[PDB]
């Protein structure tokens, strides 16, 4: 396998996802994610999606191989290596201009609309991600991004009209959970519920990015969504009180209203955050609006 022709060179991150290494695949740099022993289901689900679907797009992390190897058993997922790393890390490294901000959020919208749309082709089922955040989006050398971490993905096919929810005890990152997830009101048998959860998450990511775009000499420091009202590693109950009971949304800095681009992005992210999931914009409507914005 690719794993047997692959040498780990250096650990570029460790956390809740497991570990990510820069590896050498017959000399070529690749990313190797080593799953936690507790997270076999995420490895199995991502491997399943990458191997069984035509999941190949500029704005989705490029799959090379999955592998099992001794070191106990380790489960590896081998992909394209993006030397700039995650959007989370990148937003701490730098501020953005108008072109850079729009290129990042349009590229995320394009990946997410590509996951959400069924293609009959060639083709692919509709896919909801269910754990979108700035830490599982990669920054590419051209300034576009790509979406990673499909281990919670849910699939729908119009031909069979069947929802494939998989079998993974993992739940989303608590900070990014939509209100319907947190108060357990989500309609688990309707595919559209899952897409709407991605739109809430995407809204928070748009907020994270937009804070870092400079306008009229002013920029915000990088903060995660709800930095002001929940602690690090917030509990399910911490989040439930903020989003379901108090019905709070991230604050729009006043300085955005002196910039045409940030004014349009403030409009967009609030229509991602309707408490009523049915009222949120779709990934395709977001893509179209971002293509028009200057
Ligand atoms: C300050 N910095 C900058 C960049 N860093 C860095 C550099 C390169 C990469 N490369 C990379 N390429 C592809 C995927 C991933 C990856 C993946 C990944 C890899 C393989 C399969 N599926 C997901 N998960 N995560 C990441 C990175 O962020 C944490 C979560 N990383 C990373 C960081 C670390 C610290």
Curated annotation (Swiss-Prot):
Which residues are recorded as binding ATP?
Answer: 12-20, 33
Could you confirm whether the keyword Zinc appears in this record? no
Q: Any idea of its EC number?
A: 2.7.11.30
User: What general EC class does the enzyme of this chain belong to?
Assistant: transferase
Location relative to the cell: Membrane
Residue intervals on the Cytoplasmic side: 1-294
What does the record give as cofactor?
Mg(2+); Mn(2+)
* Result, substituting residue 170 to P: In FOP; variant phenotype
Quote one Gene Ontology molecular function term: ATP binding
Annotated active site = 131
Q: Which GO terms describe its biological process?
A: activin receptor signaling pathway; acute inflammatory response; atrial septum primum morphogenesis; atrioventricular valve morphogenesis; BMP signaling pathway; branching involved in blood vessel morphogenesis; cardiac muscle cell fate commitment; cell differentiation
> For this protein, what reaction is catalysed?
L-threonyl-[receptor-protein] + ATP = O-phospho-L-threonyl-[receptor-protein] + ADP + H(+); L-seryl-[receptor-protein] + ATP = O-phospho-L-seryl-[receptor-protein] + ADP + H(+)
Its membrane topology, per UniProt? Single-pass type I membrane protein
According to UniProt, the tissues expressing it are described as: Expressed in normal parenchymal cells, endothelial cells, fibroblasts and tumor-derived epithelial cells.
| Result after altering residue 123 to R | In FOP; variant phenotype
Arranged from A to Z, the UniProt key words for this protein are: ATP-binding, Disease variant, Glycoprotein, Kinase, Magnesium, Manganese, Membrane, Metal-binding, Nucleotide-binding, Phosphoprotein, Receptor, Serine/threonine-protein kinase, Signal, Transferase, Transmembrane, Transmembrane helix
Principal location: membrane
**Protein kinase domain spans which residues?**
6-294
Linked disorder reads: Fibrodysplasia ossificans progressiva: A rare autosomal dominant connective tissue disorder resulting in skeletal malformations and progressive extraskeletal ossification. Heterotopic ossification begins in childhood and can be induced by trauma or may occur without warning. Bone formation is episodic and progressive, leading to a debilitating ankylosis of all major joints of the axial and appendicular skeleton, rendering movement impossible.
Oligomer status and interactors? Interacts with FKBP1A. Interacts with FCHO1. Interacts with CLU. Interacts with type II receptors AMHR2 and ACVR2A. Interacts with BMP7. Interacts with GDF2/BMP9. Interacts with BMP6 (when glycosylated); the interaction may induce HAMP expression. Interacts with TSC22D1/TSC-22.
Relate the protein's function as given in its record. Bone morphogenetic protein (BMP) type I receptor that is involved in a wide variety of biological processes, including bone, heart, cartilage, nervous, and reproductive system development and regulation. As a type I receptor, forms heterotetrameric receptor complexes with the type II receptors AMHR2, ACVR2A or ACVR2B. Upon binding of ligands such as BMP7 or GDF2/BMP9 to the heteromeric complexes, type II receptors transphosphorylate ACVR1 intracellular domain. In turn, ACVR1 kinase domain is activated and subsequently phosphorylates SMAD1/5/8 proteins that transduce the signal.
What family name appears in the similarity comment? Belongs to the protein kinase superfamily. TKL Ser/Thr protein kinase family. TGFB receptor subfamily.
Q: What is the protein name given in its UniProt record?
A: Activin receptor type-1
First and last residue shown, out of the full length, are 203 to 499 of 509
